[PDB]
Write a protein that binds this ligand. Sequence first.
Ligand code: CA
Lengths: 5, 119
Amino acid sequence: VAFRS
Amino acid sequence: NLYQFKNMIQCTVPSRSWADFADYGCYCGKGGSGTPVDDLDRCCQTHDNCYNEAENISGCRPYFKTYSYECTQGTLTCKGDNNACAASVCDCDRLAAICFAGAPYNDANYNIDLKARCN
Ligand SMILES: [Ca+2]
């Protein structure tokens, strides 16, 4: 679980 | 890698900040569970699943693997000099960026309560 866009 | 994915989004959706996609619905960002709340969330679920698959490749780490790609004149392309890991990850990112571009953005679905709503 880290990020996007 | 995540830096490259950000750039893909900036190139296909120059209308909104990349951060808008970093914490949306049940799948965009951290979350990886429950019922996708809308079309955009479904784009992210496919993307999350696509990374899980790429991870099956020996030494392949989707968040960190640097691939080769181009974004110009309205076109996003994963280049031919990618190894199996780079090619898969590049494709996952590319398909998600295109998906994001055609999906409606509902401000109500930004930053929702994952624990209560993504079970
Ligand atoms: Ca996720």
